[PDB]
Paper text:
By using cryogenic electron microscopy (cryo‐EM), we determined three structures of the DsRC‐LH1s purified in salt‐free, Mg2+‐containing, and [name]‐2Na‐containing solutions with global resolutions of 2.7, 2.7, and 2.8 Å, respectively. When equal amounts of cell membranes were dissolved in solutions lacking salt, or containing Mg2+, Ca2+, or ethylenediaminetetraacetic acid disodium salt ([name]‐2Na), and separated by sucrose density gradient centrifugation (SDGC), the DsRC‐[name]‐rich components formed deep reddish‐purple bands at similar locations in the gradient tubes, and their absorption spectra were similar. However, the negative staining analysis showed that the stabilities of the DsRC‐[name] samples purified with different conditions were significantly different. In particular, the DsRC‐[name] particles exhibited stable forms in Mg2+ and Ca2+ solutions, whereas most of the DsRC‐[name] particles purified in salt‐free or [name]‐2Na solutions were severely disrupted. When incubated at 50 °C, the DsRC‐[name] samples in Mg2+ and Ca2+ solutions showed higher thermal stability and the relative intensity of [name] Qy absorption at 867 nm decreased slightly within 90 min. However, the DsRC‐[name] samples in salt‐free or [name]‐2Na solutions exhibited a significant decrease in the relative intensity of [name] Qy absorption. However, in the DsRC‐[name] the residues αn‐Asp49 and αn‐Ile51 are replaced by α‐Leu46 and α‐Ala47, resulting in the inability of Ca2+ to be stably bound at this position.
The reaction center‐light harvesting 1 (RC‐[name]) complex converts solar energy into electrical energy, driving the initiation of photosynthesis. The authors present a cryo‐electron microscopy structure of the RC‐[name] isolated from a marine photoheterotrophic bacterium [name]. The RC comprises four subunits, including a three‐heme cytochrome (Cyt) c protein, and is surrounded by a closed LH ring composed of 17 pairs of antenna subunits. Notably, a novel subunit with an N‐terminal “helix‐turn‐helix” motif embedded in the gap between the RC and the LH ring is identified.
Numbering used by the authors:
A (entry chain O): 8 to 59
B (entry chain L): 2 to 275
C (entry chain f), D (entry chain e): 6 to 49
E (entry chain M): 2 to 326
F (entry chain C): 156 to 258
G (entry chain F), H (entry chain E), I (entry chain G), J (entry chain D), K (entry chain I): 2 to 52
L (entry chain J): 2 to 51
M (entry chain H): 1 to 256
Amino acid sequence: MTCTITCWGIGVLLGIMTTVGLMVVGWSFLQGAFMGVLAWLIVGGVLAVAVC
Amino acid sequence: ALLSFERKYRVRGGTLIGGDLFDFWVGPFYVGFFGVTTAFFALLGTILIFWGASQQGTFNPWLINIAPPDLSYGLGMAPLMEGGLWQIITICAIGAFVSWALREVEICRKLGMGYHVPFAFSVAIFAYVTLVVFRPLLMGAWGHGFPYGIWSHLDWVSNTGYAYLHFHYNPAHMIAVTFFFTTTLALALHGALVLSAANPPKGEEVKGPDNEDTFFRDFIGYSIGTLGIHRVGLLLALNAGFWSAVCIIISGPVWTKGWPEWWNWWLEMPIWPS
Amino acid sequence: DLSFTGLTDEQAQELHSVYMSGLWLFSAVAVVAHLATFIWRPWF
Amino acid sequence: DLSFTGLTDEQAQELHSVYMSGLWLFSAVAVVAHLATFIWRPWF
Amino acid sequence: PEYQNIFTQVQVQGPAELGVDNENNLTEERTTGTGFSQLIGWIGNAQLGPIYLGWFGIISLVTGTLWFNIVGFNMLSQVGYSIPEFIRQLFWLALEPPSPEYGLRMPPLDDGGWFIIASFFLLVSVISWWLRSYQLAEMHKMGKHVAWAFAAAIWLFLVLGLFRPILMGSWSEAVPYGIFPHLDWTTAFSIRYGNLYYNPFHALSIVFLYGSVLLFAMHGATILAVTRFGGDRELEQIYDRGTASERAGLFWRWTMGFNATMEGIHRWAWWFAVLTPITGGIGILLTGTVVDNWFLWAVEHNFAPDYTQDYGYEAYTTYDGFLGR
Amino acid sequence: AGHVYANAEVGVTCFTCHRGQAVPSEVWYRIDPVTENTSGWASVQNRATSLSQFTSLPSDALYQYLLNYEQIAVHDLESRVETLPGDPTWQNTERTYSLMNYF
Amino acid sequence: SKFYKIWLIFDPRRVFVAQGVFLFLLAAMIHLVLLSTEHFNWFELAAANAA
Amino acid sequence: SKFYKIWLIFDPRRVFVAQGVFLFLLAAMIHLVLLSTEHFNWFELAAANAA
Amino acid sequence: SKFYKIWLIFDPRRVFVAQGVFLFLLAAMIHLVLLSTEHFNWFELAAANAA
Amino acid sequence: SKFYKIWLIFDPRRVFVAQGVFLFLLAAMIHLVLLSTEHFNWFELAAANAA
Amino acid sequence: SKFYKIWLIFDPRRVFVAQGVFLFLLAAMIHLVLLSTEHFNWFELAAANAA
Amino acid sequence: SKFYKIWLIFDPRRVFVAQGVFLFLLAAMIHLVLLSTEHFNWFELAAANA
Amino acid sequence: MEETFFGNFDLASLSLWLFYGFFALLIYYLQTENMREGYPLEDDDGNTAANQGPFPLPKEKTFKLQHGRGELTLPGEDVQRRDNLALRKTAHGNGFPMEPTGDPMLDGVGPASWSKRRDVPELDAHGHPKIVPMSAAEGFGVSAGTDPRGLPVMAGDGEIVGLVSDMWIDEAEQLVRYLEIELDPEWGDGKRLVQREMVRIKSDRVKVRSIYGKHFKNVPKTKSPNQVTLLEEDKIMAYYAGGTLYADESRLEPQL
Ligand code: BCL
Ligand code: BCL
Ligand code: BCL
Ligand SMILES: CC[C@H]1c2cc3[nH]c4c(c3C)C(=O)[C@H](C(=O)OC)c4c3nc(cc4[nH]c(cc(n2)[C@@H]1C)c(C(C)=O)c4C)[C@@H](C)[C@@H]3CCC(=O)OC/C=C(\C)CCC[C@H](C)CCC[C@H](C)CCCC(C)C
Ligand SMILES: CC[C@H]1c2cc3[nH]c4c(c3C)C(=O)[C@H](C(=O)OC)c4c3nc(cc4[nH]c(cc(n2)[C@@H]1C)c(C(C)=O)c4C)[C@@H](C)[C@@H]3CCC(=O)OC/C=C(\C)CCC[C@H](C)CCC[C@H](C)CCCC(C)C
Ligand code: HEC
Ligand code: HEC
Ligand code: HEC
Ligand SMILES: COC(C)(C)C(=O)/C=C/C(C)=C/C=C/C(C)=C/C=C/C(C)=C/C=C/C=C(C)/C=C/C=C(/C)CC/C=C(/C)CCC=C(C)C
Ligand SMILES: COC(C)(C)C(=O)/C=C/C(C)=C/C=C/C(C)=C/C=C/C(C)=C/C=C/C=C(C)/C=C/C=C(\C)CC/C=C(/C)CCC=C(C)C
Ligand SMILES: COC(C)(C)C(=O)/C=C/C(C)=C/C=C/C(C)=C/C=C/C(C)=C/C=C/C=C(C)/C=C/C=C(\C)CC/C=C(/C)CCC=C(C)C
Ligand SMILES: COC(C)(C)C(=O)/C=C/C(C)=C/C=C/C(C)=C/C=C/C(C)=C/C=C\C=C(C)\C=C\C=C(\C)CC/C=C(/C)CCC=C(C)C
Ligand SMILES: [Fe+3]
C-alpha cells in the first residue's frame, strides 16, 4: 500500500479542516463533523481509487 | 484428573511472577500467583455479599441487594452498612477480574499460544470498569454504580435508561445494539456451517472446508472464509463491548439532556429548506 | 478384590480408623461448642 | 504402606511435628489476642 | 511484538473458485460472475463469488422489494413527495399498523390497509428465503442446521407480527415499519405491560444473548490464539485432532475446569444463538395474552426487590443546594 | 395554591408567562394531521414536529390530554386482567409517552 | 462394620478436599444465618447489654 | 494419635498454599465484619470516646 | 430379595456422588421450608419464648 | 524453633518477591483506611488544629 | 404378560436414570401442589390446630 | 386388522420415547386444566365440603 | 387465559418450568457431546483415574470420511496419543508440572509438543493436496501486501538465517500458509517451513521472533518438496511455538 493509507490520511485531515471550517462560518460541531466525516469517506475514498 | 493428551503439556515455567512457588495444578484448574489472588479476592467478595445479605434480612438470591452509598457521600468512603460494603466488593471484584485475566496470560504462555483470550476479556473488564469507577468518577459520586443484586441491578438499568427520556435514541446505544444482534447472527451462522458440514444426512460423507465455503457463496453470494469468520467474529464482539462502554460513559458526563434532543443537529441543518 | 482407587483392603482399613478418629474429635468439639451455646441462649 | 506423596513414615512424622509447633504458636497468640479483646469489649 | 492474526500481511489471488458441484447440477442456476475486492480481503476472503439464484431466492427478492417499495413509497407520499423532507425525516417516518378499532378486519388503505398488504409480501419474502436455505442445504447434501437456526429467528419474527396479533384479536399489535418508530414501539410495549425487565423469558433471552456475544468472543479469540497450529481449519481438526484442538481445550480446562471439542464448541455456539429468539418469542407471546403486567407478576411471585429509602429529592438535598446558591 | 405554592410562596404574575413579550413563548396550537396520505393513529405519529419532542411519538398528546380530558393512565392495576375492548393499548401508552417527554 | 470400604470407591485426596470445602461453607452459612436473626445475633446483643 | 499420616496423602507445598489463602481470608473477613458493626468498630469508637 | 443387582447396572462411584448431593440438597430444602412457616420456625420461636 | 525447613519446600527468591508485594499492599491499604476516617486522618487534623 | 421385552428395546441404564429423576420431580410437584392449597397444607393446618 | 405393519416404517425405540413423553405431558396438561376450573377442582371442592 | 391452575401458577409460570426441564436436558446433552475426545481421564502416572466425572461417556457416532479414508467413531481409543514422552514427574503425587529429560524443542514436549496426526496431506474437494508451493500453482500471484519472496529472514536474536525462497498457499481458499526459508550454510543445510502466523513481514525483511538463529537447523523437514503431510505440519508448527518459551532461560523464568 503506502499510498492508499496516505490517501486515507489526506481524507481524515480534510475532514478535520471541514469541521473547523464550517464551525467558523457558523453551523455547529456535530453539524460540521457530519460533513467532515462525509468528506473523509468520499474524497479520501476517491483519492485512494483515482490514483494508487 | 488429566486428559488423554494433557500430560505432555503440563511443563514447568511460563509464569509472569512467582516462578514455581505457585506453579502447580489443583484438580483441572491451574493455580498461579494470580490464581492465589483470584481465590482470595473472589472468596472475600462472595463472603461479604452474603454477610451483607445477612444484615439485609434476606438470603433470597432474587432479593439480595448490596447498594452503593448515597450521592451525598461523594467519592469518599461510606459506612459499611450504609454503602461501604459495596465499595469493598468493587475493589475485590476488580482485583478478581484483573487477576483472572493475568492468570489467563500465564496459562496461554505455558501452552505457547496467543494472548487473544486475555485481551478479549480485558474489553469485558473495561466495560465493567467504565460502569462502576470510571463513570462515577466523572459524575463525582460512588453512588452512580449499579448495585450488586440479581434483580436490583435491572432497576438501575431501567432508571438510568429513562434518566435521558428515551435511551434508544442514544447514537452509541444504536451502534452497540447493532453489534449484539449481528454477533449472535454471526455466531448462529458460523456454528451452523461446521455442524452442517460435520453432520450431513445419514449415509453421506462429511464435507470439507470447500463445501461450506461454497454454501454461503450459493446462499448470500459471498463467503468470508474459515479464518475470516473467527477474525471478524472477535471484532464484532469486541466492538460490541467497546461501544457499550461508550454509550454509558457519555450519558451524564458528556450529555445531560434527553437523548432525542441530541438529533436536533440533524433536523436543524442549514442545508434543509425551511 | 474390588477397588477403583488402587488401595488395598488393609490400606483402606488403616486409613478409615484414622479418619474416624478425626471425625469423633471434630464432633466432640462441636458437641462441647453446642452445649455451651445452649446454656448461653437455648433454642428449644 | 500407603503413601500418595512419596514421603516415608519418618519423613512425615518429623514434618507434622514442625507443623503442629507452628499451629500451637499461631493458636497461642490468637488466644492472647482474643483474651485482651474480651477484656476490652466482652461479647458474651 | 508477535504477529496477531487480525490482518493478513500478504494476499494471493488466483483463478476464481466457482464452487463444488454434484449430480444436483448447482452450476446451471449460478451467475458465474465473480469479482475480487482487496479491501475486504485484509480481514476475510477477497472473492465476491457467484450467487445461486433459484426460485425461492427470486420470489423472496421480488416480494421483498415490493414490501420495501410499498413502505417506502407510502413514506414519500406522507411528506407530500418532498425529497428533501423525505431525506430529513427518513429515520422518523414509518408505515403505522392499523388502528385498534378495526380488530382483525381489513382496515382502510390510509389507516393500515397498505400495512397489511405490505406485511403480506414481507411474510412471503421471509418464508421464501427460509426455503432457499433449506433447499440449498439439501442440494449440497449438508445438514439443515442453517435452516433450523434461521427458523428460530423467524419464530420471533412470526410471533412479534403475526401470531401475537391474532391471539389478541387485533392487527394493531404489530410493529410499525420505521427506524425510530419500531424503537418507540419497543419502549411503549414494555411500559404498557408493566416492566418487560421482569418477564422471566425476556430475562432468559438476555442470558442467551449475552452468552452468544460472550461465547463468540471466547471462541473467536481462542481460534485466533491457536491459528499458529492451523486452528482455523476446524473441520480437519474434528476428523483428525491436532495440537491446535488440544491446546485450545487445555487452555479452558486449566482456566474454568472444563472444556469442549472442536465440534462441541459449535453445538454450544448454535444453541445459545438459537435459544435467544426462541425464549424471547415465548415471552412476547405470553405478554398481553396471559399476564398484562409483569412487575405485578414479579411482586406476586416474590422476586421484585423492595426499597426502604425515601423517594423525593427533598429527602437527599435542597433546590438551593443543588443550584449552589 | 396547591401547585404554585407547593414548596414555598413562589406564585404566578404576568411576568411568569410573558417575560416581556406581547405573546408568551412556548404556546402550542393543534397540528393534528402532521401526515398527508394517512388517517387515524398514523396521521399524528410518524414525524419529528415541534410538539413531538424530537421523537416519532404522537404530536396530539397536548391536545388530547391537556385540553380534552383524555385518560392518561395505561397500566393494568393487577397481575392479570381480561383485555376487554376499549382498554388502553400500546398506542395510547405511546401517546402518553409523547406527552411526558414534554413534562 | 465394613464402612472402611468407601475408600476403595472414593479417592481419599478428593474426598478430603470435598468435605474441607463443604464443612467450611457449612460453618459459614450457619454462622451467617444466626447473625441474620435478632435473638441469636451476638454482635447486637453485646451492644444491647452495653446500653 | 497418628494424624501425621495426612502428609502421606497431601503434599506439604500444595496444602500450605491452601491454608495461606484461607487463613488470611479469615483474618480479613472477620476484621471487616467487626468494622461493619456499630459496637465493635474500634475506628469510630475512638472518635466517640473523644467526645 | 435380589435388589443387589442394581450395582450391575449403576456404577457405584457415580451413584454415591449423586445421592450425596441429592441427600444434602433435600435436607437443606426441607430445613428451609420449615423456616418459612412461622409455626415450625425454631429461630423465631426461641425469641418468642424469651419474650 | 525449627522453622528453617520452610525454605526446604519454598523457593527463597519466589517467596521474597511475593511477600514483598503483600507487605506493601497491606501497608498501603491500612494507611488508606486511616485516611478514610475523620479521627485518624492526619491531613485533615492539621487543618482543624490550625484554626 | 410379555412386557419383559421392553428391555430389549430400552437401555436399562438410560431408563432407570430417567425414571429416578422423573419419580422425584413428580413427587415434589404433587407435594408442592398440596402446600399451595389451603385445605391440605399440613404446615398451616398444625398452626390452626395448635391455637 | 393389519396395523402391525406400521412397525416396518416406525422405529420402535424412537416412537416409544416420543409416546411416553407425549402421554405424560397430555395427562399433566389435562390434570392442570381441571384444577383451573372451579367446578372440577377437587382440592377446592374438598374444602367446601368441610 | 388469566386463570391460575393452583395458587399463583398460571400458564406463564408453567412454560418457565418446562424450559427449566428442557435446559437441564440440553446441558446434559451438550456436555456429553464434548467428551468424544480425551476420555477416560487418566492420571499423571498414565493409569485411569478413580474419578471420571458426573457425566457418562456418550454413545458412539460415526464420521464417513471422504476420499476413501474410512470411517471414524470418536468415542474410543485415540490414535493421536504419543508414546515415549521425554518427561519426568517433579513430584510423587498429582497436580505438578513435568520436567523435560532432554531438549524440549527436539523431543517435542510442552509448548513444542505435536500430536500424532495422519501421515497424509490434507486434500481439497477434488482430492489433490490442499497446500502446495506457488511454483506448482498455476495462475496464482501476490495481489496485495508485501511480497516476502527474496527478503532475508531475521531470527529472534537478530541473526540472518537466510532468504525466503518460496511460499506455500492454500489454493482452495487462496490463503498463504507457509513461507519456505533457504537456510544459509552457516545456519542450516536446506529448506525449512514457517507458518504465516509466526512471521511478521516488513518492507525489507521478514522477522520471526520465536526462534533464535541456532534453532533453525533443527526445524522439522518435509519428506517431499511438493506437499506436506498433516503430521509434518503439526511438527513444524509446534517447533516454532515451542520456541516462545524454550529459546532461552529468560523466557522460561518469570518476568517479574
Ligand atoms: C477488634 C479488636 C482488635 C482486633 C482483634 C484481633 C484478634 C482478637 C485477633 C486479631 C488477629 C490479627 N489481627 Mg486484628 N484486631 C483489630 C485490628 C487490627 C488491625 C488494624 C490496623 O486495626 C490489624 C492490622 C490487625 C491485624 C491482625 C493480624 C496481626 C492477625 C490476623 C492474622 C491473619 O489474619 O492473617 C494470618 C494469615 C496468614 C497466612 C498471612 C501470612 C502472610 C505472610 C506474608 C506469610 C509469609 C510466610 C513466609 C513463607 C515466611 C514464613 C516464615 C515463618 C517463620 C515460617 N488487626 C482490632 C483493633 N485481631 C488474630 C490473630 O491472628 O492473632 C494471631 C487474633 O486472634
Ligand atoms: C424499553 C425496552 C425494553 C425491552 C423490550 C424488548 C422487546 C419488546 C423485546 C425485547 C427482546 C429482546 N431484548 Mg429486551 N427490552 C429491554 C431491555 C433489554 C436489554 C438491556 C441491557 O436493557 C437487553 C440486552 C435486551 C435484549 C433483548 C434480546 C434478548 C431480545 C431480542 C431477541 C433478538 O435477538 O432479536 C432478533 C430477532 C429479530 C430481529 C427478528 C428477525 C427478523 C427476521 C428473521 C429477519 C427479517 C429480515 C428483514 C426482512 C430485513 C432484511 C433486510 C436485509 C437487508 C436483506 N433487552 C427494555 C426492558 N426487549 C425481544 C424478546 O422479547 O425476545 C423474547 C423483544 O421482542
Ligand atoms: C452463636 C454462638 C457462638 C458460635 C457457636 C458455634 C458453635 C456451637 C459451633 C461453632 C463452630 C465454629 N465456630 Mg462459631 N460461634 C460464634 C461465633 C464465631 C466466630 C466469631 C468471630 O464470632 C468465629 C470465628 C467462629 C468460628 C467457628 C469455628 C471455630 C467453628 C466452625 C468450623 C467450620 O465451620 O468450618 C470447619 C473448617 C474446615 C473443616 C476446614 C479447615 C481448613 C484448614 C486450614 C485445613 C487445613 C488442613 C491441613 C491438611 C492441615 C490438617 C492438619 C490436621 C491436624 C490433620 N464462631 C458464636 C459466638 N460456633 C462449630 C465447630 O466446628 O465446632 C468445632 C460449633 O460446633
Ligand atoms: C467482549 C465482551 C463479552 C465478554 C467477553 C468475555 N468474558 C469472559 C471472557 C471473554 C472473552 C473470558 O475469557 C472469561 C472466561 O473465562 O469466561 C469463561 C470471561 C468471563 N466473563 C464472565 C461473565 C460475564 N460475561 C458477560 C459478557 C461479556 N463478556 C461480553 C458479552 C456477562 C454479562 C454482561 O452478563 C457476564 C456476567 C465469566 C463467566 C468470566 C469471568 C470469570 C471471573 O471473573 O472469575 C473470577 C471471579 C469469580 C469466580 C467470582 C467473583 C465474585 C466477586 C468478587 C463478587 C461479586 C462481584 C460482581 C459485581 C457481582 C454482581 C452480581 C449482580 C450483578 C447479580
Ligand atoms: C436471533 C439470533 C440472530 C439471528 C439469526 C439469524 N438471522 C438470519 C439467519 C439466522 C440464523 C439466517 O440464516 C438468515 C440469513 O440469510 O443470514 C445470512 C438470517 C437473516 N436475518 C436477517 C437480518 C436480521 N437478523 C436479525 C437478528 C438476528 N437473527 C440475531 C442477531 C435482525 C434483527 C435485529 O431483528 C435482522 C434485521 C437477514 C439479513 C437474513 C434473512 C432476511 C432476508 O433476506 O429476507 C428476504 C428479504 C429480501 C431478500 C429483501 C429484503 C428487503 C430489501 C432491502 C429490498 C431490496 C432493496 C433494493 C435497494 C432494491 C430497490 C429497488 C427499487 C429502487 C425499484
Ligand atoms: C403558570 C405557570 C404554571 C404552569 C402552567 C404549570 N406550573 Fe408547575 N409550577 C408553577 C410554579 C409557580 C411552581 C413553583 C412552586 C414551588 O415550588 O413552590 C411550580 C412547581 C412545579 C412542580 C414542583 C417542583 C418542586 O421543586 O417541587 C412541578 C413538578 C410542576 N410544577 C410541574 C408542572 C407540570 C408537569 C405542569 C404541566 C402540567 C405544570 N407544572 C404547569 C407554575 C405552573
Ligand atoms: C400563564 C401565562 C399567562 C398569564 C398569567 C398572563 N397571560 Fe396574557 N396571555 C397568555 C396567553 C397564552 C396568551 C395568548 C397568546 C398570544 O396572544 O400570543 C395571552 C395573551 C395576552 C395578550 C394579547 C396578546 C396579543 O397577541 O395581542 C395580552 C394583552 C395579555 N395576554 C395580557 C396579560 C396581562 C396584562 C397579564 C398580567 C396580568 C397576563 N396577560 C398574564 C397567557 C397568560
Ligand atoms: C413531574 C413528574 C413527571 C415526570 C417528569 C414524568 N412523570 Fe409520568 N406521570 C406524572 C403524572 C402526574 C402522572 C399521572 C397521570 C394520570 O394518572 O392521569 C404520570 C403518569 C405516567 C404514566 C401512566 C402510568 C399509569 O398510571 O398507568 C406513564 C406511562 C408515565 N407517567 C411515564 C413517564 C415517563 C416514561 C416519563 C419520562 C419521560 C415520565 N412519566 C416523566 C408525572 C411525571
Ligand atoms: C461467616 O461467619 C463468621 C462468624 C463471620 C465467621 O467468621 C465464621 C468463622 C469460621 C468458619 C471459622 C473457620 C475457621 C477454622 C476452621 C479455623 C482453621 C484454622 C486452623 C486449622 C489453623 C491452622 C494453623 C496452621 C498454622 C498457622 C501452621 C503453622 C505452620 C508452621 C509455619 C509450620 C510449617 C513449617 C515447616 C518448616 C514445615 C516443616 C517442613 C519440613 C520438615 C520439610
Ligand atoms: C439450610 O438449613 C439449615 C437449617 C440452615 C441448615 O443448617 C441445614 C443443615 C444441614 C443439612 C446439615 C448438613 C450437615 C451434615 C450432613 C453434616 C456432615 C458432616 C460430617 C460427616 C462431618 C465430617 C467430619 C469429618 C472430619 C472433620 C474428619 C476429620 C478428618 C481427620 C482430619 C482425619 C484425617 C487424617 C489423616 C491422617 C488422613 C487419614 C489417614 C491416612 C491417609 C493413613
Ligand atoms: C399436573 O397435576 C396433576 C394432573 C394433578 C398431576 O399431578 C398429574 C399426575 C400424573 C400424570 C401422574 C403420572 C404418574 C405416573 C405415570 C406414574 C408412573 C410411575 C411408575 C411407572 C412407577 C415405577 C416405579 C418403578 C420402580 C419404583 C422401580 C424400582 C426398581 C427397583 C429399584 C429394582 C431395581 C431394578 C432392577 C432391574 C435390578 C437389576 C437387575 C438385573 C440387572 C438382573
Ligand atoms: C428510493 O426507494 C424507494 C422504494 C422509493 C423508497 O422509498 C425506499 C424505501 C424506504 C426508505 C423504506 C425503508 C424501510 C423501513 C424503515 C422499514 C424498516 C423496517 C422495520 C424496522 C421492521 C420492523 C419490524 C417488522 C416486523 C417485526 C414485522 C413483523 C410482521 C411480519 C411481516 C409478520 C406478517 C404480518 C402480517 C400482518 C401478516 C399478513 C398476512 C395476511 C393477512 C394473509
Ligand atoms: Fe469455529
